[PDB]
């Protein structure tokens, strides 16, 4: 008659996240600036379901999750389905960690996103950049991913392979594989990652991409913390063209009582095609944030950032290649709340 | 081990609503009548999640809600995302009421919908009418809305501002602001509202709209209740054209034991453009309903209505302006159930 | 303060289902084979809500359900809305069974799907076939369905009528009706069903379809179980053309301890148009499966199947008629898990 934790085979969880963001664009076209700029709300709130089950006849515990998408992001319409964010089944056991099948972050993307896309560094460092093909996937369906245990309390590995975007619709044979490693050393964590994408169809060619990342995170007792990463992207097209572009991201934090101050910087350097530097193909971003720990489950923040994007380039089909800079440079001021349950 | 109300940081709620609706169209084209008319089911059922949190370091209580859309409405395909209906975050405190950010009803729209679009008066009084620009938003994303407390147990105010439909996609600079007030006087409630829409792009112009509303609702001890509203819509286009149209809606109810009888009527009067009446631009609807209070949480109803729409007009670009009458006049018989938990 | 079953007016339920499926196509075009074939994950996981209410003033119990769609199927993108699968309201009472309004399986479709489309026989026997018009609906909105009680513990009937696919959007006047009956006697069940579709618009004509089904299922105590069905499809177009096609499906199972071995076969025979057999319009599939009962609430399985589809035909507008064979023959190896809560 009376319920316990065991009465249910699932848990609802949520991230309630609302940002009010004012953008000021300087694209060169005043109408486009009026259109893209101004105040919006960016509602990144999402609901998920998850659970576990010890099957009677198999030792590794079954796990599963189904996570909804952002319910009303800026620049988009209302509503999200279930299964748009990390959504998987899997198994776990103490001695070998976990394996997940479904829709998860790639090992490389996970590091690109956290720590290195925060606060607002993502237009440059996440999906920014000018390279052809596919530098990496991000959250990707049709994936198998292994997460190792924390060996000797210090070292862990994440490895995955998956189908590409066209392959997932029965429209291509693209695929990828990736791996990351993490090592904890006193106040530091060292990070390294790789992703290779193959059979990528774009601009009339087939591409292979290889992306490499090295990074550090540190947390010191006097309240200073930081991160830094360097990311190296290479791409080869089936007509013989080679491209390379590198990038970096860094952040510095000072935490005192219920406050975190943060500065962030990220940059993509000029792209190189067949040994030649394409001028003005770099991007950068500077960001400042103050965050208040309003509760153990929530934060309030204020943020200011300035994005200075590349001036454009063509792809290998002689048409403009789309980048995060195609819509122009902008600055943004924002405030927000996030709450976790 | 045993659960309480406090074990969860969310509540699921729902409105389970099904209507079987038979429409008989008289559009002037027999094939169109056959297509638009006939029996459908209108499943307006929806699920929502909501909760609150007292943040340790902030006095006003945090509130949130994520509401799904109608799961299978008539004239539409199956399935709704989370966040299609009222979906927001906010804060509340006894002395100042509540503030919500996200997707909510405008102050004007809320009164236009309830009481004045029920039962089935909405084709005329909600989204019906012939005026250019945007007479008002309805449920709108990118909104901040304040709801005052009930001052002196009599008077309350709802005020809001938000981004327009194009601005929410980064495709324009439309916006709007609105306010409503409610005053209790014996068995009556008096209502007034305003909305102003700006930078609305349509028919090759930019438009400003101003809409005003005044109303009454009454509930008497002998079982009679009623509502009546008058609504005045004005619009100015950037080429100098002015338009005006007004409207009304009224309803009379008799409640006895577990039954409510209801008659409803709404009309849009002829539109005026630059001081000249456009003939046959009016609409009206008459509706009758019997409702049974089948449970404290539910109702059953039967409803009959007749819609007589305008005979068409052009917009300022010399093409037909779409209205709720464009698909033709129709009558409708329906039965339904609604249940709340 | 403490919660019971009665504290909630709804239950969450789910089917967590993941299949890893490798397809090898032989379409005649090596690029198309590369595109459609390869490994995908087919995530058929879904979440639902359901509940009941005894209304104070009505004896038949109110029932409802809202079921989400597959969260990330193969050949499709991520995310599903609530209300994509069986989503309805209804009433139930011991003496007359249940009545549902909304989105449910048709009586014919329910038998076509289970037992007769498992394991992987659906390309041929569910949506396969070459006949014009609409052989039957499957899961359909705008439906009323009655499920009788089990009379004398042996005999039951399911009957339904509904609006068609165009009618549901206000774009046509299609409709259907169907019925099925089941008789249980010792270790056998006999099945029979019918569906008639009317006013179906396709290929420049209006169609009527009539589809008939007879079947048997058996379950014996020595671990042998089986099913077999015969399905007869007839269609008449408004220009006088008659089409007929028949089909079958059968399966044999052997269950011992926690294992089920299964073989399945289904076929569509050559279609006949105006008394003439259209050569090479048949399809068939053979499938083998081993299933392990890993828990009382879950299964693991491995499956191999070979599909051999028709070589194409034209519809009555002299263009290719789409069938489940249009993309070419393929074989498939898969493994999966399903778990129910
Ligand atoms: C980007 C890297 C940021 C590094 C932040 C500083 C980390 C720690 O600095 C404080 C050093 O702690 C040792 C204290 O040294 C002073 C000791 O003086 C003598 C008293 O015993
Ligand atoms: C302690 C680490 C210090 C690292 C300093 C290296 C900074 C590199 O800055 C230049 C990279 O290019 C980014 C600037 O791009 C701006 C956009 O350019 C407009 C036309 O491309
Ligand atoms: C200022 C508030 O006044 C409310 C007056 O109510 C008028 C209702 O008119 C309805 C006409 O159909
Ligand atoms: C308060 C509602 C009473 C409405 C009855 C008016 C009937 C007028 O018929 C108009 C025909 O259309
Ligand atoms: C508080 C009592 C409210 C009394 C409501 C009376 C409403 C009168 O009916 C108006 C509907 O008129 C329908 C057709 O008339 C068209 C004339 O156009 C100009 C409007 O004055
Ligand atoms: C002259 O009348 C011809 C009919 O015109 C169509 C108008 O629609 C009905 C409007 O009812 C409200 C009138 O104010
Ligand atoms: C369409 C033809 C498929 C026929 C397969 C029938 C095989 C079933 O074997 C039954 C023999 O049973 C011997 C053992 O009986 C144990 C008690 O069973 C009670 C009835 O299930
Ligand atoms: Na804008
Ligand atoms: Na939005
Ligand atoms: Na991708
Ligand atoms: Na119709
Ligand atoms: Na519908
Ligand atoms: Na709007
Ligand atoms: Na493929
Ligand atoms: Na998929
Ligand atoms: Na259908």
Author numbering:
A (entry chain B), B (entry chain A), C (entry chain C): 10 to 350
Show the paper's wording.
Subsequently we cloned VhChiP without a signal sequence and with a C-terminal His6-tag into pET28a to express the protein into inclusion bodies (IBs) and avoid toxicity issues. VhChiP from IBs was folded in vitro from 8 M urea and purified as the native protein. Well-diffracting crystals (~ 2 Å resolution) in space group P21 were obtained and a SAD data set was collected at the absorption edge of Selenium. In vitro-folded VhChiP forms a trimeric assembly of oval β-barrels, each consisting of 16 strands, like the general diffusion porins OmpF/C from E. coli. Unlike OmpF/C however, the N-terminus of VhChiP does not form an intramolecular salt bridge with the C-terminal carboxyl group. Instead, the first N-terminal 17 amino acids of VhChiP are not part of the barrel and extend into the periplasm where they form a trimerization motif like that observed in the phosphate transporter OprP from Pseudomonas aeruginosa. The first nine amino acids of the N-terminus are disordered and not visible in the electron density. Thus, five out of the first six residues of the N-terminus make polar interactions with the pore of the protein, suggesting that the plug is stably inserted in the pore. It should be noted that for in vitro-folded VhChiP, two residues (MG) were added to the N-terminus of the mature protein for inclusion body expression, and it is possible that the presence of those additional residues has destabilized the plug sufficiently for it be outside the pore. The N-terminal ten residues of in vitro-folded VhChiP are highly flexible and do not insert into the pore. Consistent with the experiments, the in vitro-folded trimeric channel shows a theoretical conductance value of 2.13 ± 0.15 nS, only slightly higher than the experimental value of 1.8 nS measured at lower voltages.
